[PDB]
Amino acid sequence: LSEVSVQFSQLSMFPFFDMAHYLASVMSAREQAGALDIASHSPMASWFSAMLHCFGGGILSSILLAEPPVGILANTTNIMLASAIWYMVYYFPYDLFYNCFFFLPIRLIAAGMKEVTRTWKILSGITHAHSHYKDAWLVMITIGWARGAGGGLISNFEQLVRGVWKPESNEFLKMSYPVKVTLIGAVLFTLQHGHYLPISRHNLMFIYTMFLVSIKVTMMLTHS
Amino acid sequence: LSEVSVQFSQLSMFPFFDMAHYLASVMSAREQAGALDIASHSPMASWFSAMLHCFGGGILSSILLAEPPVGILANTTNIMLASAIWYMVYYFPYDLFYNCFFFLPIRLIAAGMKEVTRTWKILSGITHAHSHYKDAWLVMITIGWARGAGGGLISNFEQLVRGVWKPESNEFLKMSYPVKVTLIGAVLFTLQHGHYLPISRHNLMFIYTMFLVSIKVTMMLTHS
Amino acid sequence: LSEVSVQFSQLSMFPFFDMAHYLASVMSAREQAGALDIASHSPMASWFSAMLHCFGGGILSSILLAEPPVGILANTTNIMLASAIWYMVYYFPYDLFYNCFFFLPIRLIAAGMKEVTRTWKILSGITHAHSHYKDAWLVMITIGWARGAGGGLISNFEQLVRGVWKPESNEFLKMSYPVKVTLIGAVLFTLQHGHYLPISRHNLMFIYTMFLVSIKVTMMLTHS
């Protein structure tokens, strides 16, 4: 039944899903070590650290392609759309926001939707790298991977933003789960655009997104 | 009497004022902790650290706009115009140069003129960001702010140049005086170009520059 | 006998010499402190650290010229041509590869050929900077120098890649031999393109390359 994947390929991420990626990235940034004191004593650094979690893919993909990073800041609808989620995650009255989204089902849904945004980020970087370089495979892998897990690769300098400098925890030394999954996805969809992978783009899209959401849901259910 | 602000708006900064910004930035860089030993044992690193103080605004504004930083190095008149001030600040015979410019009135004048260069740097970044992005407010704030206090934002990596690595003293954690003032100015003049601020550009220019020079003069008089 | 330098100027570096630069840079990267454990426990970080040794000149010259660094990754023939040398330097059976190229004559030849690649990298950066900026001397010096010893200038962040963070060993504080030699060469050939240096390009090319190869050969013979 390939008629369902065609329906899945018509999804738009502007209203609902972008807020889900921003919310999962901002909450996951808050749950990190010493992130509450940053927002309590330096809202600027915590806000910028949140933006590195939300728009790290576009930032790294722009720096790697010699594209202006401030171009990501031009979309005031997305920047404000993430900054509101930041201010509600940290400075909501009685912390009613976080306590609402820390609930297990809501957290599962939000995270699972961020996993969906990751896909269109990977393909966006692959097709964009194709717009800059025709049949260059490594470029498409690098930019699609850069949009898939951008915040995870700038995680060292992002740590440097909040104030923690860990020169030992490099992403290449020990590849984390989301970064390595974004590598596998970038390679796969790069083989898809190059037609080296015998499957249509929509079906590979759907099966990859499902294989990601199922894994993260299993991780969050087995962690609690 | 708005006829005086029109006369103030016709100022040119190529001869006198650029040397004032370079001199205040180089002297303020020398007065930092452990900067004399750098120039005494490694003139290259002290020179580059001085260039990060002088041309940090153009460097950061160029990196943020995907513009070549080496483009700032093309203007050999400005680069030499600052390098001469560096070599005279550090390696002048009997230190007759620094001891002359460390005098309170001369230091007040030079610093106060650097405060004037900061304004045209902010507006240069705002109008330049307008040339790259029409009515994008955050871009104009970011580039005007990037030219206002560029050396203050690269101050971490600039510290890394001389040899001191302080991951705890981030500019976003504790915003210093010049950086936060450049933020306020970038926001104000950005509202001016967008015509959200009910005042002409020249008058806002003059009152902002005066409000800056008066504050720094008061700081230098109350510090000694 | 200027007829021999004309024959030397017709050299092509695509097959033999590029592999020599990649091999000397990868081997010299392995001989660094704690580089074997990186390749034994994290092949990704050791591979990227090797690419920073091989393509550091193009990377830094691309970042300084606002050119996409991923553009260096487009040439899959060169990237694979270096990655094969990396995998053979580290993971060859019985370490038969390294033990073969660590032999004194073979090491002398490979290093001496890397010294030859350095020249065409310097001139490539100088003529490229001329394509971006006509008669800007400092730009040509900066880009030619950036291609001459690129890995030596990113050596701090390259150290940060493997996991060692040394904020005290800056290249400007103590200029190493290859970096300072690349500075002298960039200045000389920049004076050549500007015709301030009374010598033809080919003769200066040959005498500079010889003056480099002789020095490195003398160093490797006096070190063992």
Curated annotation (Swiss-Prot), chains A, B, C:
It is a multi-pass membrane protein. Residues 1-12, 66-76, 119-136, 194-201 are lumenal. It is found in: Endoplasmic reticulum membrane. One of its GO terms (biological process) is regulation of release of sequestered calcium ion into cytosol. Homotrimer; conformation seems to be controled by binding to diacylglycerol (DAG). Intracellular monovalent cation channel required for maintenance of rapid intracellular calcium release. Acts as a potassium counter-ion channel that functions in synchronization with calcium release from intracellular stores. Activated by increased cytosolic Ca(2+) levels. This is Trimeric intracellular cation channel type B-B. The lineage of its organism: Eukaryota, Metazoa, Chordata, Craniata, Vertebrata. The chain holds residues 4 to 227 of 284 of the full protein.
